[PDB]
Amino acid sequence: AVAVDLGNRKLEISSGKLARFADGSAVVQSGDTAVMVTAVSKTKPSPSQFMPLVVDYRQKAAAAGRIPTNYLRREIGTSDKEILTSRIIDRSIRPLFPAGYFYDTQVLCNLLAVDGVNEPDVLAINGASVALSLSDIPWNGPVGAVRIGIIDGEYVVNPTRKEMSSSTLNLVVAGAPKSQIVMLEASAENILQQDFCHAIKVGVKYTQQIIQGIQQLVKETGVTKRTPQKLFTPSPEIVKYTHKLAMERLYAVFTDYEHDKVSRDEAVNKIRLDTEEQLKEKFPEADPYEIIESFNVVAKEVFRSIVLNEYKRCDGRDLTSLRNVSCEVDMFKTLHGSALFQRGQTQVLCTVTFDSLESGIKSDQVITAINGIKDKNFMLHYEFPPYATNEIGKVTGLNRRELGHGALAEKALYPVIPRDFPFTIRVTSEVLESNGSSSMASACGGSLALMDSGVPISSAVAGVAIGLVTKTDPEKGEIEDYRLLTDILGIEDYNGDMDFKIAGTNKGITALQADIKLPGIPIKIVMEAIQQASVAKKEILQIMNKTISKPRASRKENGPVVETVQVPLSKRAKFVGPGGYNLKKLQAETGVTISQVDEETFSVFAPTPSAMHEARDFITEICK
Amino acid sequence: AVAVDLGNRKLEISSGKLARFADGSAVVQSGDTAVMVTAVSKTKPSPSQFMPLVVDYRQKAAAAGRIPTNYLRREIGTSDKEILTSRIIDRSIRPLFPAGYFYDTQVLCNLLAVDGVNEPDVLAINGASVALSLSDIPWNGPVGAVRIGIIDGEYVVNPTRKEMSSSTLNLVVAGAPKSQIVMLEASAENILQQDFCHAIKVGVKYTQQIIQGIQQLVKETGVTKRTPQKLFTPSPEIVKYTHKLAMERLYAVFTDYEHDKVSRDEAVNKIRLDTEEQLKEKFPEADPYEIIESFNVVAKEVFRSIVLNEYKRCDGRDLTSLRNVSCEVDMFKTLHGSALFQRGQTQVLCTVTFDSLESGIKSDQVITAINGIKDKNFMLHYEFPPYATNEIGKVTGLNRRELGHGALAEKALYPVIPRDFPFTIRVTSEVLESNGSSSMASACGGSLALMDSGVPISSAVAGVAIGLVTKTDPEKGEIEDYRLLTDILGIEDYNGDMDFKIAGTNKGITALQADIKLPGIPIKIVMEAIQQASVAKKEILQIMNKTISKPRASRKENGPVVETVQVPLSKRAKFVGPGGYNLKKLQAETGVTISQVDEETFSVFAPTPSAMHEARDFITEICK
Amino acid sequence: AVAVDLGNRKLEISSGKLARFADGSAVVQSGDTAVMVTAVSKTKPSPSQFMPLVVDYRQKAAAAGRIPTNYLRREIGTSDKEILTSRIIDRSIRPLFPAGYFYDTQVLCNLLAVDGVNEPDVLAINGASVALSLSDIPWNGPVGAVRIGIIDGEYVVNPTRKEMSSSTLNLVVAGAPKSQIVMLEASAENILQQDFCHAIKVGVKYTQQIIQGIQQLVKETGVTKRTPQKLFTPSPEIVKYTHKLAMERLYAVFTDYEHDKVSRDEAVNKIRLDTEEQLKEKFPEADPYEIIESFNVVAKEVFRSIVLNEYKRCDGRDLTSLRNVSCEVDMFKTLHGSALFQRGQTQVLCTVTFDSLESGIKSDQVITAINGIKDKNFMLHYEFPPYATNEIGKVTGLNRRELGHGALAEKALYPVIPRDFPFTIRVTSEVLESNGSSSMASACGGSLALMDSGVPISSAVAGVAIGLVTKTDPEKGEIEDYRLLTDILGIEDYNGDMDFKIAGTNKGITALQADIKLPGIPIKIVMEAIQQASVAKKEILQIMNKTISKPRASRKENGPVVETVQVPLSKRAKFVGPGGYNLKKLQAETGVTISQVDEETFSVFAPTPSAMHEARDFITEIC
């Protein structure tokens, strides 16, 4: 039992009492909130040639707060914010696993108790760090996680629920030993860059205090790590031979600036087929997968050597050069708002829909105290269809990535959404083509569609993703020199070291999500990434402003119409029908929804004026 | 961009703007309704031994200007209107793929915008044809699709929603080049055969104009088809050796009229086990699947040659003979209505249940999944349990075929269902045994169970399936000769060319679904099939009328009751409970349904008099 | 075709009319309720290397066939009441399949008609027996099943729905020929042990009459059984050889009382891996599964020989001794009630949550009917996370076992739950570690957490699982001798003959579920198990009473409260908002629920007193 003091807060870490069967287990308590995290890793290598790691964060201690009816129904009971928390924990611990650790691993977080004051999400990240540190699962170094808020100008570590309601910043920092950064997740209320950077500095300092506390617990316990029967990394002598066979062929492909996404991939795969052939007879005893990963190591190394040595990219861009950006608005007449944003070979179509404020809400499956009500009556739905990458996939449900990307784009656009808007705003972003940051293009395209729909947003929001290529020595593991890339392609994200997605208006920052694939990066690189992204964001906003610079003076004339109709007490029963039958039928046949305002007035909402006059005669016949 | 004038309608076809990574893509716009269809096909052969083709038509709510109304504010699950549209598109495009194209293929439809006037389902069929035509996927000639309705005695091409509500016919025709027919899907208000037949030729004439426009677009934008890695068809020399090995044994099996479904299958499989083992010895280097497919081709060729050369079928019937038909009603006392319909070895049990009117409108927002309404308060649920074929399979969820068969049998019976029936009519049809058209037996047994239940349907409805065996010219590809079969078995559907399911009253046609396996058939074959099924339908109605010829004068004594109760204002609070809690508790432990029709009076629906007795007991004791 | 008379009740069994394509089909009718059951078994050996058997009891309507629900199955799925019936049917027919019958098999139930009087669940068990009896599937003698209830002191066979509502016992007995018991599943209102044992005697007598009727129907029909392509049982030559290489090593492992669950399994695996290589060399033609299965048979027989010959379990205790029991309550300040029950290496954490009574109903007429309404506003939720056994598994949703264990533990605690409690009571049992009866530990821990939470239960409830090791000669199958084990581990459950779970207070029995793996056991063995478990249950209640002996004087001061607020007619519209937006906005902000009770009265339920302060701020702000 170790206590770590974080300012006025206290973090208690325990182990050895609950779930002694699991490979690692820990209980993290802050105030009267306790989170229990376990880690399990199979000793038999998985058939798949990657690291299968699943993180699941649940609130099963309340039985989901209700009684879901069926097994299939239970596949939806998992809350949205529980999926988002699992994604944050996953990105905090994934980079620290050893390379070639192809073993099925599961990290489970169980909310023992919640006091409604201390947020359990930050405790879950620390619990995952302690559980892996105390387990025999090889995992490099503990990580500490804190949430930084800005309340009336002060910087608060791990703010309570009440403090978060008055904070202009919601930043979560995961830090590795010697002040490295492994995860960043922020949601700011259009705050200045300097204020944002200072909060990262304060947060990283606090995570180091957690790391030394966890390190004290590890020494007291006496953790011993397992020896995996095989770490699946290509032997250096086969990688070296692959380098000889494909160095020049791969270099020519990557220095050819005429390639597009498909042409470059076909060119690389054409080399892969030729090299993987001769590699087989030279090394007959090599594993079939080992040959594939040997080529992927060489192709990645050649790709990184070009940008490091020559300060040029595979499509001829310089380090700070954007892709071609084109925008359109109002492409379909019947949509309330529409925009088509293209960034290189990434294409996103954004739609805006309006609805009643009281629409939704009456859903009965409120497993928590969670219903259709959002903070500003604003939500963003993100969809990534399989044809965006010329792929085949089922369209049943939203996977974790689509739900995570939608929340990120929603965070980016949230601070500029107005209050007291008469309608519920829903923005739908559909990725038609994907070669880059469709997540950030949903913020730019969503911004354009919001102005095109006539929503009076305070400012336009643009996002961009910053990549990173580093040179790291094998004797120390320190970063010697590095390059930051503006508006990375898909191959630069795949062969890079991070996907630093950051969005905001022309004067401030609204959202950030850093997905670092390295085992930590210095704070210096993070500060420069925010600055480099600031210049790119201004350039994107200038292109967007040419297409549309301000919201339209009014909504489209073919949009929703809201007004009241009177029904006296005498004719109330016939109008609503037996048990509200007539109103329910009207909502079924036509989209018109009728709600009771006062004892004698009903508010009629019609999604289109065409659907309005259709239901106008329906209430006329009822009124007889 | 190509424009097609379909009478007073307009069709706009475009490509090359949206979703450029997909193998094929197209946008089809009529009026203000736009649909985007993409087609993706893998270049690597599928592990399965067939063509996996999936069509997923999505009715996204953003296109219609509505926000999903559950607590997640996002659409969950698949609606039954989307499944039916996916089946029509699948029926229109599947026959045109080359034989042996064992590659994973997905066609996706995205509703860009809908104006509430032009129906997007027909546009999605044309969009799938354009996307496949412009892609590199090997696909035969373009397909044009139109909807024909009869409004005030006039034929209208692609009627709007307003005209579709007043039409007596809803026919969808998909045509191939040279006026062939690849898909027919109609529901009619018991219209005459002549009027139905004229609409098919009017529709086919319009689909040729669409094909003309699509071919112009294909010419303008160059299309080069891919060369598949290989086409999985059995070698002609291997097939000819199988014929010399099993033609005589297979001929004896199919001329043995004492067989039933199971014994004939055992006899055929007995020949297959002897022949395939000899085939492996003769062709050791042949593909294991090539052996299986070569026998299937030889068995199909022998089976069809008997019908063509001798006009006699495998069970001894001639081309127009029905199977044995047996009907029975009043199976169980507690059922509101029931019927057991036997057609050869196909056995169907149909049940009628009278539900409350309120349960008909499940469209209310309470559903976390999707739900809607039915025009008349009539619906049919069709079950195909695994034991109907003596096999083991999943029984819970998501069987598109069950949904398609239920919708077909439902629209067959819909025209005769009375209006203003005081209850919701739910018909459940379970296939206890299947050796043929259980979907049409569901229509026959559904009408028997409806008359037995006491529903005053206007006329009895019977359905039948018409098969087809053709002798196609090997080179030219036209039909040299053909035979039409009445009331086909399962084997004649599987080894045939079409499953022409058509139902109707003795004086008209109510439903039609033609499942053509050929790459198009002439209109003269369709016309003869409709006439041949007219003769069979009268014969079936003659047998069914012997069991029961008119609806029973009243519903069964154990049927549902509706009557109102009176509660005073003082006892209203105790009766209803806090937030209507005591009401929801009463209808959950009794099965009744209580609705408030006035301040003082409540209406009570009970499925049985015993259920009403218990509810009456609770009402009086709560009132005192 | 055959009629079986059970007292004042009648059972009509028929076949040969419906679903003639299935391998076996039967219709069982009692009164005006008819159930059709089919049985299909593939002739191709499945690659699963075990017996794939799935039973799907599907009903067409809820509320005793009064609210249709079958059309919703594509979107909603299968209700839990259908899963529980499918498990009862599965337990009755699974042990009678021959060993090595590795063929995919499905039993499907179709409620052709229900009258709202006779329960179709009992008919489905009989129908599954008749369908398998008339089929060509190799399956042992017919199984009869009845339900026994106690109404005003008398014993009633197959009681109607009205009778079951006034019964103090709900016992389902599935009997094999020669008065063997195959399945036992009961829930009682804390009835005496003597009354419980007599009902089992009455039930087995009735199941023998049903078996006579089925045997008559089989003879008339003329059933001939298929010959399966192969029966996957290890050859005696290789089973004997495995006994030669691994008997002494396995004997030492099972006589080492210093082992725990993990270490004992590792030691057996060490012998197994060493034995597999020797077996493969000695029998190169042997199938890979045959090598594996021979070791499992030899290890199982060595394990049982120690209990039979030496009367000592693998962890050193005698046949009656319990494992170490440790209880702990009130571990987290914010939980309404909590308890951590430890029994050997099994650890369960139980939590009590008070919710509003309004949360009981789903407010959708059909969906509320599907899952029903818990009678005392009490439910138990059982979770078996994958880390409880140091494995990785799917997390969302509950498997069949989790639903069954939750229903069993809720039945055990139901009789002591008080009536007219102001709040809905939800108990969550989470298995942190598993080495034995976590389902019965959920009953003990749930009782501790309920007294800790301040719920005035009538008495504490404890459960236990009784094992069985028998020695039967292969010729006849009768039981020469047997040992009954108290509080079995996982290895003794796995290598044993039954998992006899029974729970109750110190003066009665509230729940029972017997999972017999033999093809029936004598009734005298069952009666000894009940008595032996009553002594063990006494020892557990003595330990639990030391931790907490009576419910706390009142609920925790941070628990939920319910109070009323008066809003006038003039302020009603503003308070609720147009379309009830304000009430649901307050619910989404603070978690409180406001329900209108009269014209002026609104009842507010708040999870915490602080949450009610936030709600009260809104109420006065509007007014």
Numbering used by the authors:
A (entry chain B), B (entry chain A): 46 to 669
C (entry chain C): 46 to 668
Sentences from the paper on this structure:
In all forms of life, PNPase catalyzes the phosphorolytic degradation of RNA, utilizing inorganic phosphate as a nucleophile to cleave the RNA phosphodiester bonds and release small RNA fragments with a 5′-diphosphate and a 3′-hydroxyl group. Each subunit contains two RNase PH-like domains (PH1 and PH2) alongside the K homology (KH) and S1 domains.
To understand the structural basis of hPNPase-mediated RNA degradation in human mitochondria, we determined the structure of hPNPase bound to a phosphate ion in its active site to an overall resolution of 2.4 Å using single-particle cryo-EM. The phosphate ion is present in each protomer and coordinated by S482-484, H450, and R446, located in the PH2 domain. In contrast, our cryo-EM reconstruction of hPNPaseapo shows that the pore is occluded by loops extending from the PH1 (residues 104–124) and PH2 (residues 405–423) domains, which are oriented toward the center of the pore and restrict the available space. For the hPNPaseapo, we observe three distinct asymmetric assemblies of PH1 (residues 104–124) and PH2 (residues 405–423) domain loop conformations throughout 3D classification, henceforth called hPNPaseapo-loop-conf, hPNPaseapo-loop-conf, and hPNPaseapo-loop-conf. Only hPNPaseapo-loop-conf1and the hPNPaseload allow a neighboring protomer’s PH1 loop to adopt an α-helical structure extending toward the active site. This enables interactions between Y116/R119 (chain B) with L443/N444 (chain C), facilitating R445 to form a stable salt bridge with D101 (chain C), thereby stabilizing the active site. Importantly, this stabilization may be necessary as hPNPaseapo orients R446 toward the phosphate binding site, a conformation incompatible with RNA binding due to steric clashes. Active site stabilization and N444 repositioning may allow for the upward reorientation of R446, facilitating efficient RNA entry.
